[PDB]
Amino acid sequence: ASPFRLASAGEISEVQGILRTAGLLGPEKRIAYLGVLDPARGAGSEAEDRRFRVFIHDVSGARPQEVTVSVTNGTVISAVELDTAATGELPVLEEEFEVVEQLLATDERWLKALAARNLDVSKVRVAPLSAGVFEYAEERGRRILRGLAFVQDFPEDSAWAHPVDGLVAYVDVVSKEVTRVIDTGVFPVPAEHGNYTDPELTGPLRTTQKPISITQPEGPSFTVTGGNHIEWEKWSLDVGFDVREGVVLHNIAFRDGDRLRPIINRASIAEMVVPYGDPSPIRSWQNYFDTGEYLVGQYANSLELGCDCLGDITYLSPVISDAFGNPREIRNGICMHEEDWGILAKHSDLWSGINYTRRNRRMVISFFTTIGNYDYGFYWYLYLDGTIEFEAKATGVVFTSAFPEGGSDNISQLAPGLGAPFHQHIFSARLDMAIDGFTNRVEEEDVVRQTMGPGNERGNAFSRKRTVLTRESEAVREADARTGRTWIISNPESKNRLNEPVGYKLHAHNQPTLLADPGSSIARRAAFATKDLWVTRYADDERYPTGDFVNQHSGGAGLPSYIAQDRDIDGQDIVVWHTFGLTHFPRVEDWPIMPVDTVGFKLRPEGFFDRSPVLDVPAN
Amino acid sequence: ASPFRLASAGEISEVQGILRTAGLLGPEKRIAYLGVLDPARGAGSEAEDRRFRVFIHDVSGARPQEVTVSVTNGTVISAVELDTAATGELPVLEEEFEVVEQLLATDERWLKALAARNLDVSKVRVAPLSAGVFEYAEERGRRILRGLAFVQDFPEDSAWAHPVDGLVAYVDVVSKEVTRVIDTGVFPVPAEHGNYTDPELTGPLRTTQKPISITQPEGPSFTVTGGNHIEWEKWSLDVGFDVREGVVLHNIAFRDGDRLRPIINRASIAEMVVPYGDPSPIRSWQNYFDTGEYLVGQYANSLELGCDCLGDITYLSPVISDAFGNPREIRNGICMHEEDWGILAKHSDLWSGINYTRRNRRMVISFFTTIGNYDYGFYWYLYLDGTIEFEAKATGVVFTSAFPEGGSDNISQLAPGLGAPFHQHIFSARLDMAIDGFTNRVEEEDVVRQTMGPGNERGNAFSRKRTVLTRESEAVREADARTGRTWIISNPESKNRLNEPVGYKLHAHNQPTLLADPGSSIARRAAFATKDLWVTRYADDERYPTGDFVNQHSGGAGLPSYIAQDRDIDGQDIVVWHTFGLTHFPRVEDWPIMPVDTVGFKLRPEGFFDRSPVLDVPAN
Numbered sequence A, B: 001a002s003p004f005r006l007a008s009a010g011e012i013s014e015v016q017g018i019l020r021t022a023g024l025l026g027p028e029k030r031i032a033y034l035g036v037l038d039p040a041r042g043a044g045s046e047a048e049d050r051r052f053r054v055f056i057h058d059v060s061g062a063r064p065q066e067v068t069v070s071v072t073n074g075t076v077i078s079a080v081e082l083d084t085a086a087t088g089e090l091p092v093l094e095e096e097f098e099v100v101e102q103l104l105a106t107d108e109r110w111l112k113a114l115a116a117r118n119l120d121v122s123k124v125r126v127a128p129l130s131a132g133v134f135e136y137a138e139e140r141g142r143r144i145l146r147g148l149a150f151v152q153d154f155p156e157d158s159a160w161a162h163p164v165d166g167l168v169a170y171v172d173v174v175s176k177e178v179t180r181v182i183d184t185g186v187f188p189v190p191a192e193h194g195n196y197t198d199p200e201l202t203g204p205l206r207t208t209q210k211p212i213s214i215t216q217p218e219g220p221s222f223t224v225t226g227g228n229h230i231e232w233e234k235w236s237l238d239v240g241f242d243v244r245e246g247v248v249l250h251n252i253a254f255r256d257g258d259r260l261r262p263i264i265n266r267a268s269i270a271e272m273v274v275p276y277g278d279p280s281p282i283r284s285w286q287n288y289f290d291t292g293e294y295l296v297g298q299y300a301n302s303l304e305l306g307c308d309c310l311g312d313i314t315y316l317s318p319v320i321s322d323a324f325g326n327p328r329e330i331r332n333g334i335c336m337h338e339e340d341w342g343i344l345a346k347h348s349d350l351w352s353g354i355n356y357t358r359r360n361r362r363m364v365i366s367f368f369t370t371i372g373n374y375d376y377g378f379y380w381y382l383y384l385d386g387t388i389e390f391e392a393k394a395t396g397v398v399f400t401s402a403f404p405e406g407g408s409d410n411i412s413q414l415a416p417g418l419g420a421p422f423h424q425h426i427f428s429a430r431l432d433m434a435i436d437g438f439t440n441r442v443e444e445e446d447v448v449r450q451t452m453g454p455g456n457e458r459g460n461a462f463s464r465k466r467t468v469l470t471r472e473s474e475a476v477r478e479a480d481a482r483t484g485r486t487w488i489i490s491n492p493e494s495k496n497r498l499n500e501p502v503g504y505k506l507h508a509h510n511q512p513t514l515l516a517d518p519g520s521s522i523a524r525r526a527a528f529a530t531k532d533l534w535v536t537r538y539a540d541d542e543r544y545p546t547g548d549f550v551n552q553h554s555g556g557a558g559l560p561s562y563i564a565q566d567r568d569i570d571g572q573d574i575v576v577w578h579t580f581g582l583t584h585f586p587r588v589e590d591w592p593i594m595p596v597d598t599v600g601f602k603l604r605p606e607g608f609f610d611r612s613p614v615l616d617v618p619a620n
């Protein structure tokens, strides 16, 4: 009876029934988002109220609605009509993707663009991409996708190898109208295929790899109770799943002796942005928020044993809603397992003669999603020593273009005539902090260099300083790798045995943040991505760094709007938002399918425990 | 018959015989360093000449010698008398460590310091530490160690828990004389033990961990021929071992179709420095160069199956010389194995219907060393996709002090009365580069932000720039994480199929470098550690970033002296020296034995291959 259990097929059917009976889910309506709501602060109210938030699209052009329902009481709690021209459009629907290609195939401007290139329309695939917000007045209040074309020589062909450059179209997906077709000129379509299963490209497959067998003969050391509650090596947490954010971790806590100590109340990747750096009018609008606009949870892969997840794997199969309110199961959508992680601690002491070695281990919780050409893996790691780590793994096929004759400063060439525009993949981690409870504060810690002089006559001394972040208006921080800058989240009211406040230290990778001009559209809409660290005061409605409705919103929503409230965050219920990203200058080695690259962050205890928390690990 | 084979016990015995017969190894002589020399450039001279370099100490005070011998011809090639007051002392001898405690136990100044603290001399251990170079005129030309005292309550007790602060002694280890005893005042000796095998500290050991079994039923995918030549998944290299540097990788090369392509000629950690940031006169001299002064290879641990190395492990057992020229085997000193490394590449394509997943793997080559309280793991990783990675793992027991009453800006408190001075652990990787051969160059690559304007009207564009390093005088580079700074090593005369020079990209962690004042002793002696990247022109005698004789050398040797030659490095045989380090502000969780922390770097192909080099990996 945990309030944090996964939504069941029955609850989603119940939500469908409640909405139908209320007159809110007739034949012209579509569910664009459905997800359970987290309990409010202070769950002392006995018996849970399972509430679901629903975004309802209307395929006849009527205004969409935000609806909250309670499946425990079978009632609609609230239903709000939305002004999308003010507060943004709903997330893209899956059935709207398939529509961009079909319309264009009968538009005469599109057909004459293809004829001039001697391209057969039956072979042209259209990548349907989110539109953004630029200088096209007629788009405001309309639901628009943009399309870029790729040639597929046969049904099994990798279309990404054959971009049709100089051509882009804009499609109104509700009225089914092609608003614009832009043809800036013909480019040669690159002719080499990129088919990575074709023996003529791969050569003979290696025979030199022998199997690695990872087994757990007595089963794994973690237990799962209540469907989704995990206990492993003093850690306790619940694994949630949201169709928008994907895997969500709740109630991360650590058993320190006879007391359960909270660390993180809720952890998620709350937004994702992929901005492209090609100034060509064909692609200069190209940005998408995979989480906010497409919902990355709903594109999770079924993960196959021995291929995606190797070892003794426990699977969760989350349930989401389709566009009509029917439950859909993502089978084997979440993998969890533990894996060996080398040496934990080691010392051979000459004075005592004692030799000491212990192994480390980590709990892995992961899923994979696929949007178009991209494939992203989200990995959460819990370690024996109290460390929590997140890792994003980026792979798939690079988004391609023609490579211009005479070169480009914003595209790299992967093959004769084939380019790959420069871009970033930038993530926002939302960490609802609860270090030993909810009274928390954040300090910025910088290394401090000291000058040679009195009290330091040999010039060897160095130190550090910590600056407390007391209000939101001062809580927008940038990285500084040169001074070893880190951030500590502590509880000023909970002290270790040395009478110092307990804490956790956030270690960033210090990769570049959003590179676009600060006056650009994408800088306004992805404002969170311009700084490495934000801290806000907790509020139930402040869930996403870009706002609730990111699709075609003009910008400034989310974090810059939260921060302007200038709320007290010194010993308060606070939320940490960490931006981190990969800047991708594609390489020849990324073609025709890229090897994984990674980015992330981690948190390590800093005076949280009264000594090493792994003294009780045995030798084996 | 490889010139890069490991030294055998027979070769070391032969070196002993040659030196004895030549009158160079009488009863008053000690071998302070012995190691094989790398072949000279252009090994077209048929039949190898195995040459060994020897440092010979004289325990009667006579001048030491550098000797080169050829075991193939049984001759002394050269013997040079050394002026240690000019060019530095020989590395510390193991038998000199045990001497600091024994002398002090009968010195009356030491005995009265202990009496005033009510300490029993039979219980006081003395950590014998390298001396450095400061303002003590009488030390020049003498072989000196400094000692700090710790109390050991019983033979099995961890002495590090009981530092005796305010007390330090200086010992001439050749004449067996105590030069100085400094007593700045009594501090309470901390009384809590730090015994991490004591059940009263550990509590009952966990019973919740179930075994992880990693087996290879058909054996491993790598082969070892000639004792130390490795082939694994298109990689070819030789694993050398040097008593000073530890594991050395030679001839790293990759089989690209029907041709062996070199990448790195020699890879090593060529120096290590651990500077302390406590201004107290008791510790303000405390710096050591574990590689240059102590020789980290000779303190390698025997690694135990299932504890230090888990899986299907192949061991190498290197042979080194003891102080009299007798061979000594470090049994199981080097572990090599392959391990699973998650997803390599993955794409689920909707247009083609093809689902693709492949696993990654890495070859691991590692050893561990123990110097005093410190334990360091050196890990080299080779990945399927061409990536080479190094990782240092730092653990052991922190070096301790008293914690002052009223606090400290340079020490953290770990336990009541117990402090741990701030310090760094800084490494120097020496990468003798050979990207597709020996004509190489280095470029610095910075991300370039573009302003919104004509040719970028939407303000989304960004790019990069590469600056070629043409002479050594411009090849001393600093990190810049904010602009994503990286360095590419390329071969201007070897182009990929796109007619671009082949290359490898060095990705640094961008941690802080040496923090000491630029006018300090340690900044002069560890000058390499003040900058992230150096490039020199290759030369056979330029092996270490600090020089050949680091013990008690006054500074400026090594890299700053190499660089001043201002040699041509644009398309030349070049060497890359990368500084990287951990800045350690000890935490309560580091006590009483610390969990591993890590730092390192990696190199990834950048247009080296004509496409992804892992297209031929099978599915399993």
Ligand SMILES: [Cu+2]
Binding pocket: A394, A423, A424, A425, A584
């Ligand atoms: Cu990318």
Ligand SMILES: [Cu+2]
Binding pocket: B394, B423, B424, B425, B584
């Ligand atoms: Cu340390």
Ligand code: NA
Binding pocket: A265, A432, A433, A434, A438, A538, A572, A573, A574, A575
């Ligand atoms: Na909070």
Ligand code: NA
Binding pocket: B265, B432, B433, B434, B438, B538, B572, B573, B574, B575
């Ligand atoms: Na070289």
